[PDB]
Structure formats: C-alpha cells, structure tokens
Symmetry: C2
Subunit: 258 residues, 2 copies
C-alpha cells in the first residue's frame, strides 16, 4: 500500500516548484522535507504520496469538541500514515501520536524589521510602542500561553488581549507584517524559519537575541503504526550520515540571497 504523507506548505520545507503547472504527483514539490521524505522512503523501502494538509494547520485540539485538527488530526483520525514537516514534538501531541527522535533542533526566536530597537524578549515586555505576536494553532503560541516565566507571562498577557490581533494565520503573513510595519511589529517564530528568512531579500529582517527555549521537530506516525519504529531508526541513520546537515545547508544558505 502506498504511504499517505501529510505535510504543510512552509518554506523552505515544502514549496511548489516554479514550474509545478506541468508536473504531477510528488514532482510538483521541492524543499527540505520533500528531500527528507524521499530519503526515508528509500531506507524503509516504501512508495508514497505527498499530500498537503487540508486546513493548512500543524495540529491543535479543540478545547470544546476535543477534536484534533491539522496534520496531527490527519494522523489521529487515520487520514494519513505519516507526517513529514516542521512539526514540533510536544507533550500534548506525544500523548496522541508517535514522534521519531528529532531531525532538527530549534527554539523560539525574535524577528525584527531591521533598525528596530529590540535585542531581547525582555525588551519587548518593557515597552508598548512595538507590537509583537506569534503564529496561530502552533507550539509557539501555546508556549507563551503556558509559560510561568515573568517576562514570558507578561508578554502573553499583552498578546492575549492585544487589539487588533497580533496573531497570524501563516508564517508568510507574520514576516509580511514585520516588513510593512515600519519596525512597529516584531514577530516571534521558530529559529529555523527566522534564519531562513533573514537570508531572503529584500534582506530587511533579522533575528535578535538567543532562543527563548529548546525543542525539536520530529516525523510523526499514528500510535500503533508499523512504520514508527523503522522511521525513527531511519532519522537517526540519516543524521549520523550527515544527510540532515547536508540538507539544511542546501535550502537555507546555498540558496541565500543576501
């Protein structure tokens, strides 16, 4: 049986090729996770089909219905066999799906226009002239919602009631908001994404300060999957071969335009 892989359009992980109109199947896409999926499929020896998650979300459980959405939802309800994307390994998700060891280590970071007078999370929490937010339905937002750290809790109290909303639907919208806000909007996002964008023209953004936390992305499978064990060993094998480091260079700096 062909393995149904659920993923999400997020540069440089999964993107449609410039000439995708004349292409079909998995060939329509390119990126870090597209290469990784190919690598995994080869070592575990299976055929697969890349599918973009219907609702474009990573995965969160509805507090009222208790229903999981996003890529996590597709695994939980059996719509997909494996998720290969920048999906954060978290406690709540670990309880409903399985994750391989991390294929990438990262942390929450700050993105500023450039020239913006901000160097740390503390700086953001001390003023109100510069607004800041995060993505929606993701591990980053949940981080600030649960944090007990003075600075982070103070930041959340602001973002929670901020008017208008400082939360964005996609990373692309976040970066776009930073760029057109005259340095009046800062964006909190995963370090890996921050670094990628900083190397993209108009080269007008920059990551500042150290990461606020440490986490990792993992390949996810439903609980009780015959692929979980194998995929986990594949990820470790790949990291040890240097393939994962080979791939990050290829999509982050080899294609850098700054």
């Amino acid at each position: 049986k062909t393995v149904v892989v659920t993923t999400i359009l997020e540069s440089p992980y999964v993107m449609m090729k410039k000439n995708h109109e004349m292409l079909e199947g998995n060939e329509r896409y390119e990126g870090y996770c597209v290469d990784l999926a190919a690598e995994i499929a080869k070592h575990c020896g299976f055929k697969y089909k890349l599918t973009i998650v219907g609702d474009g979300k990573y995965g969160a459980r509805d507090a009222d219905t208790k229903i999981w959405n996003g890529m996590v939802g597709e695994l939980v309800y059996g719509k997909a066999d494996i998720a290969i994307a920048p999906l954060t390994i978290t406690l709540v998700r670990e309880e409903v799906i399985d994750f391989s060891k991390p294929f990438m280590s990262l942390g929450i970071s700050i993105m500023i226009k450039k020239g913006t007078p901000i160097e740390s999370a503390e700086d953001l929490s001390k003023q109100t002239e510069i607004a800041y937010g995060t993505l929606d339905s993701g591990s980053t937002k949940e981080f600030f919602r649960r944090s007990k750290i003075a600075v982070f809790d103070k930041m959340w109290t602001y973002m929670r009631s901020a008017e208008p909303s400082v939360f964005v639907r996609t990373t692309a919208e976040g970066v776009a908001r930073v760029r057109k806000s005259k340095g009046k909007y800062a964006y909190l996002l995963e370090s890996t994404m921050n670094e990628y964008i900083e190397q993209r023209k108009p080269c007008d953004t920059m990551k500042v300060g150290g990461n606020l936390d440490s986490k990792g992305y993992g390949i996810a499978t439903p609980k009780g999957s015959s692929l979980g064990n194998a995929v986990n060993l594949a990820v470790l094998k790949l990291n040890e071969q240097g393939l994962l480091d080979k791939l990050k260079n290829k999509w982050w700096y080899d294609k850098g335009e700054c």
Copy 2:
C-alpha cells in the same frame, strides 16, 4: 520495587559530595543528573537508587564477543532499570535499548589551550604540529570512525594511527592533557562538556569553531520496559516547564569560576 538507576561520574552531571563519606544512599551525590533523576522519579512516581556504572563506560558492543559494556550493558543485561546520564542517542544503541526524547542538545566540539592557532576541524586536519584525540569508547570516537566526510575521515586516519595514543580514558584526562600540552594537543569532546570546562579555573581552555555535528542525550531504559512511556513524557513536560534550562544554568554558569 526500587528502580535501579545507572549513571556515571562525569562532572557536572554526577559527582561525589565533598562530605559523601558522611552521607548515605542517593544523598552521596550531587549534579545535573542527580537533580534530574529526583524530578523524573517524582513525576513518574517511583523510588530509586543511584548506582555508578561498574566499568565507568558509556556503552559499546564488542565485535566478536558481542557483549555490551558500560551503562548500555547494564540495561541490556538487566543490571539496571534506567540510565540517567549524558548518554548519547545513537542508532546502534537505539537498536538494543529505548531512549526518551532528548533532554539536552549538543554536538562534537574542539577544546584548545588558550592561544593555540586552531579555529576549526579543517584547521586540525591540515596540520600536524598539534595532536588531537577523543574520549575512548564513546559516541565521539565512533563518529570519526564511521564518518564518510572528507575532513573527518582525514582526522580519523590520523587519530587511529597516532602513537602514542591520542585517545583518553576520561574527560578529566583529556582536559588535563590539553592544559599541560603547551598548546600541542587539542581535544575533541561534546559541546556541553567543553562549555562547562571553559568556565572552570584556571580558565585556560576555550571552545573554538562551530559544532561538528548535532545530536542529543536521552534517558535510557531496557527495551519493553514499563517505565519507558512515563519517563519520556516526564522529559517533555520538564522541558516545557523550563526545568531543563534552569538545571543547566545552575550547574554550568551559576557556578562559573571565570
């Protein structure tokens, strides 16, 4: 029953308290992993006994005899129920024991005596005046032995044939060798340890260059263990609550001497 925890005397992870002769049981030790063990036990709800691995090794399989030694061996043969130490998550180990998601991210790094004209692995590979080696019997040595990357394979070719041996029995031995080498010996070791030593008197060593690779330490249990699931969730919960970050600051920088 009381959970038997295997660990290793590696500062600042596990160390004998100054007046350990005056104490009993778990109270004899202190350190990052001693603190982590207490927390994992509380959150999983089990009583435990800390024991230092008999042979002072991390874990490797002897080709020919096929016997596992070190902490891995204690888990494989049933001498310990869990290992809480700076134990690297690797494919070969993952094949015989279970690892929780990582509680710490790190990579192989270069330690030099201050003033040594070395800034990268490439620098070490292109010269011969300065000798270099690694801990013997661990994942660092294995990294170089198994590497297919030009620079690292070149480094391994030298190290494996160097005489006298450039390998060391313990980290303390490696650090002492760097300090008394007058800059003629560089040491390859895990970043976390390098960072620790750089903050210790006499403050004469320093970490140079970026990490050679990326990986992590995980809590290990025997395959099929009843503790596996719970311990893994505990690690994720503890990371999301900031404890892991608190602990590293406590043992690395809060007690810095430089």
